[PDB]
Design a protein around this ligand. Structure first.
Ligand SMILES: [Zn+2]
Ligand SMILES: [Zn+2]
Lengths: 63, 25, 127, 98, 81, 223
RNA sequence: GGUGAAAUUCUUGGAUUUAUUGAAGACUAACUACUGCGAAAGCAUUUGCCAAGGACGUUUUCAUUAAUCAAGAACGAAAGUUAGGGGAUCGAAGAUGAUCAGAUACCGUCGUAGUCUUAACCAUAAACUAUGCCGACUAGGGAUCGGGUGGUGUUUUUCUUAUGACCCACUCGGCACCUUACGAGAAAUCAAAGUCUUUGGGUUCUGGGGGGAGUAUGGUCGCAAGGCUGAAACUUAAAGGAAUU
């Protein structure tokens, strides 16, 4: 379970079936300054650094 | 107008139906 | 070198099938498939069921060696649920990242040219 | 009273229409009055375009935007939260915002 | 509106109007001198012949059936009456 | 158990079976598309018997190279054994259900027609056709609707071209007319005066009946 | 199989699945739309035949020829009825597991028969656009289907205008819509409910508080089912429509 760490440059806005995924823009520090966003939920601000698993992922709407 | 007493009327006309049936049959 | 086929994914709202089928058109392998593994009796059609079935498919593929197939993402059709639910996505994705040869994803949802009337009486279901 | 001039149907010169069934509950409904929907939707989630694009021979397969048609009796069409209710003085506008 | 003078309306009013609705009733369409390439059968045919009118002398059928206004069959010269 | 056996391991298909090879009609670049497996070809009910006659859907971009041979698929018929190979005869061609579903959009009509025609050979073939209302270069009429008499004129026209082509030649040359969609171009140029009529295409060519043995083409496909 | 979750299934004598071929019947989804056609019930594929019909064309003719209309007739959604015909995942009652405080409301499986055709009834409905049918006059816009009226318009070039195709200017006819009244209205709202105490263009109708009750009783139509016409006595001072809190 490779672990990587990310910070949000700008929060986007909650969305989901009933509030599913907390949009947390994962600037995984090894490839910081990018806009790739992955599966994150939780309380949200900007300034924290948390854990993301995959370095590279894509996604459409979480229907 | 209120259809709840109309549902009463529906039911009781089914009643008249069975009763006139029993007499006439 | 390559041999192609169709995995014949069969996505319902319950217990989605998988069956490797070469382009011979009538040749599946090991009917024992996803109707076996997630024995929670309501996870038969869950994304985890799909992904696990997909590792089963990758293993089956390698032990039979046909690296390639084609993709018919399928609904139940008839008079019910002509849009496959979740019971297809994870199996596809894990098969894709499971060392196979992808090709020709397509839609065989059989919308009938106006066949029989649907089921449930005029009023239908209640909720 | 007089709520929806079209009776929420939009035929207004007709007076019979062949029925149409649901697909979430399998309930009938008049066609024009009903709420069905077209889905020009992606064949696969773009949470897969990378892997699928790579492990595909004949590089750059078309990636077809599949279509479909769902049929909802207004029951399912508000139970599954498609159409959102409004007021009177706002209901009038028809042109969907997206 | 709110003032007008309709007794002798300007011609464009009628031109933009339909008969049977004008001020002074009148029709639109009119006759035509059909002139055949052959013998100079200087004939008269109305603009809506409605029927297979033919030249008297030579069988050079002139006005084909139409929806409305006649159609000269590409050979005759017409003189508006 | 939950899966019940009221009563009222499986190993090694591979050795208990064998592969056999696609052998496409000569009009295709590749005389092979894929493999099949089948019971070991021991006589006394040779499974090669329960091999002849099968059908297979394949890609024509695959057997003629160019990708634009994509959204049609060709059905081929298994005919007879050549040993490790199967020279398949032609059986038909359709769109891919997705693409045909794709061209159907709103605010334009469809125009459909059917026909059934015989051939130079004795192979009775049913053929269909679809077409649609073009929207003129300067066209603003969002509708683009095709009034009925126009429909019937165009439909008949299609029937005459197809009749002029089918009942006139052999199977492989029919495929050759098909793959270039020359028939398409004939239709377009003939019909363009009637109505703009774009997305004109064909489809769904199917077999009905053939004479009993006809070893002729079944052996002439290859030497 | 299932929503919030179970029973009932054949088979290791073969199965929910895989394709390969045979038969009934329903209906033409997608395009199928604030879009057609009819009197209204309705009617969706393609074709032939049969007539019918409307609308527009009209420098044809008949010369008040008519509009509605108790009596009388025709059609008449779906249900049912008689017989015959067909007999399939799409079915009232009846079986059938749990939700079972109680399921003979829900809900899954099995499912007669109406579901369909032919011969006859049957004559209702949320047959409501809840706006009877004519016809006469008035407000502004745009779209749209069937016609035509012009335009060197454009493209296809059968072709030059146009008739194919469109485009733009004018209409006349089909379902309408959005601003909208000063005028209505009790109001929600009005393209008819406009032109109404500043009361009358003409006709066919139907009802005077609610129940009792469209009930009883007579006729009458039908084989019943059933309608059609259908009162009181007694009881009661409110039922009730819109609209706001
Ligand atoms: Zn529904
Ligand atoms: Zn002459």
């Amino acid at each position: 379970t490779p672990v990587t760490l990310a910070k949000v440059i700008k929060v986007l806005g909650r969305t989901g079936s009933r509030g599913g995924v907390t949009q947390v823009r994962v600037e995984f520090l090894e490839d910081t300054t990018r806009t790739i966003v992955r599966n994150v939920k939780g309380p949200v601000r900007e300034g924290d650094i948390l854990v993301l698993m995959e370095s590279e992922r894509e996604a459409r709407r979480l229907r | 107008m209120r259809a709840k007493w109309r549902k009463k009327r529906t039911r009781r006309l089914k009643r008249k139906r069975r009763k006139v049936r029993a007499r006439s049959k | 070198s390559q041999v192609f086929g169709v995995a014949r994914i069969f996505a319902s709202f319950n217990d989605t099938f998988v069956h490797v089928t070469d382009l011979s058109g009538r040749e599946t392998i090991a009917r024992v498939t996803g109707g076996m593994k997630v024995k929670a009796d309501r996870d038969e059609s869950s994304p985890y069921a799909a992904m696990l079935a997909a590792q089963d498919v990758a293993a089956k593929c390698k032990e039979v060696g046909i690296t390639a197939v084609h993709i018919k993402i399928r609904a139940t059709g008839g008079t019910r649920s002509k849009t496959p639910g979740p019971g297809g996505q994870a199996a596809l994705r894990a098969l894709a990242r499971s060392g196979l040869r992808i090709g020709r994803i397509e839609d065989v949802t059989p919308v009938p040219s106006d066949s029989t009337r649907k089921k449930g009486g005029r009023r239908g279901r209640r909720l | 009273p007089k709520k929806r001039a079209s009776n929420g149907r939009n035929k207004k010169g007709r007076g019979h229409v062949k029925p149409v069934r649901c697909v979430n509950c399998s309930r009938s409904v008049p066609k024009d009055k009903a709420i069905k929907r077209m889905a020009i939707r992606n064949i696969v989630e773009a949470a897969a375009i990378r892997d699928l694009s790579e492990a595909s021979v004949y590089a750059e397969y078309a990636l077809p935007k599949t279509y479909n048609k769902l049929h909802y009796c207004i029951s399912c069409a508000i139970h599954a939260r498609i159409v959102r209710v409004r007021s009177r003085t706002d209901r009038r506008i028809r042109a969907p915002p997206q | 509106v709110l003032v007008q003078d309709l007794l002798h309306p300007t011609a464009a009013s009628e031109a933009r109007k339909h008969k049977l609705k004008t001020l002074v009733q009148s029709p639109r369409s009119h006759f035509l001198d059909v002139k055949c390439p052959g013998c100079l059968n200087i004939t008269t045919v109305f603009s809506h012949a409605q029927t297979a009118v033919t030249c008297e002398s030579c069988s050079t059928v002139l006005c084909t059936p139409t929806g409305g206004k006649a159609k000269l069959s590409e050979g005759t010269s017409f003189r508006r009456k | 158990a939950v899966g019940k056996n009221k009563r009222l391991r499986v190993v090694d298909p591979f050795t208990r079976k064998e592969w056999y090879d696609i052998k496409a009609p000569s009009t295709f670049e590749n005389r092979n598309v894929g493999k099949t497996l089948v019971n070991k070809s021991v006589g006394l009910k040779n499974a090669s018997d329960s091999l002849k006659g099968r059908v297979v859907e394949v890609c024509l971009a695959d057997l003629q190279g160019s990708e634009d041979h994509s959204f049609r698929k060709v059905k081929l018929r298994v005919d007879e054994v050549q040993g490790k190979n199967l020279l398949t005869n032609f059986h038909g061609m359709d769109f891919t259900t997705d693409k045909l579903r794709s061209m159907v959009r709103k605010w334009q009509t469809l125009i459909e027609a059917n026909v059934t025609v015989k051939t130079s050979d004795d192979y009775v073939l049913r053929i269909f056709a679809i077409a649609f209302t073009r929207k003129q270069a300067n066209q603003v009429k969002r509708t683009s609707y095709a009034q009925s008499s126009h429909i019937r004129q165009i439909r008949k026209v299609i029937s005459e071209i197809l009749t002029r082509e089918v009942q006139n030649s052999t199977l492989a040359q029919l495929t050759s007319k098909l793959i270039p969609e020359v028939i398409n171009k004939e239709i377009e140029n003939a019909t363009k005066d009637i109505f703009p009529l774009q997305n004109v295409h064909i489809r769904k060519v199917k077999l009905l009946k053939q004479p009993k043995f006809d070893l002729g083409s079944l052996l002439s496909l290859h030497g």
